[PDB]
């Protein structure tokens, strides 16, 4: 593609200048390669996410079938999605976030204390993955299987891995632990209007992944951005900016979710362009969060930025249910790293070849 090649190596290295030019010339752009419109402005992406009747997550409505193991909260829209959405909302909000912050603070400190002895380690493998996997298993209230403690099978073999995970989920539902999102789901299911069928099981799988790979990649993106921005780490070290506001700026700046796809169900004009029923639109929210029309000086990392109405947690009917867990994870991680002021890069990052959910596979670091 002449404008946007998401898996081009030079593009993966830094997509944001490519997003900017695309936004500047064709903010609503038809991409033949991806068979989708590409919206790079905050206003357009917000509209895409706030009208399920016009832009749907259920691609069956444009006659694309859903693999049965993928029909879930994520791939349904109201009214189909609604009982599940509310059940998940209810089980999440029943959790004690103060207790979660307390135990994650201890875990982050002991992780980095052990990694302080190294002179160079991969922040991704040794902290981001370990920390987020601990958080999501404790939050859901399940134990890692001894034969696959890293859940490595679950990152046809894909069909077999989904069926194995579904087997695990059903055993959890049948014998829930003493706390967490899943035991509260079990408690709340009678009278929720949700059936304990395959859609529920698939939804637990989707919840796990939403609460694992996504925050893990954010934590790596965020630290990489701080290390690569002159003065940004030292600003945190000095207490010059608050962590809450810094975390929201880091989500805006390098939040992992790059693309949210929707199916167009009614003709619509956007940026002058006539999007047609049956076509796919892609809200490039990574680009939208650097849209100058919404954020002044958007390509500059401003840890004190206020206001900051970023799209990093989505909008509307499918907005992120774990966003306050994500914020606790980031806040805890930064405070824990800040106990080791000499943190510095220790080699080059390498980017995962992923244009949809952006992250690093390696982030060489030392704590000093
Ligand atoms: C920095 C971390 C995170 C970011 C940036 C993030 C971002 C997002 C975004 C953009 C969406 C919208 C998806 C869409 O519109 O199709 C979403 C949905 C969702 N997120 Fe998060 N998320 C994060 C962490 C988490 C965590 C930790 C959990 C669970 C503990 C979680 C649970 C969910 C769920 C269940 C949904 C689906 C909601 C639905 O489809 O109705 N997320 N997330």
Numbering used by the authors: 11 to 165, 182 to 394
List sentences from the manuscript.
Rufomycins constitute a class of cyclic heptapeptides isolated from actinomycetes. Several nonproteinogenic amino acids are integrated into rufomycins, including a conserved 3-nitro-tyrosine. RufO, a cytochrome P450 (CYP)-like enzyme, was proposed to catalyze the formation of 3-nitro-tyrosine in the presence of O2 and NO.
The RufO crystal structure belongs to the P43212 space group, and each asymmetric unit contains one monomer, consistent with our gel filtration results in which RufO is a monomer in solution. The structure mostly resembles the trigonal-prism fold found in CYPs and TxtE, however, several key differences are noticed. A water molecule is weakly associated with the heme, forming the sixth ligand with a distance of 2.5 Å from the iron, which is in agreement with the six-coordinate low-spin species observed in EPR and rR spectra. RufO has a larger substrate access channel than TxtE due to the widening of these two regions. As a result, the opened active site in RufO is filled with water molecules, and the heme is largely exposed to solvent. The corresponding positions in RufO are mostly nonpolar and uncharged residues, including Thr85, Thr67/Phe69, Leu286, and Val238, that are incapable of stabilizing the amino acid moiety.
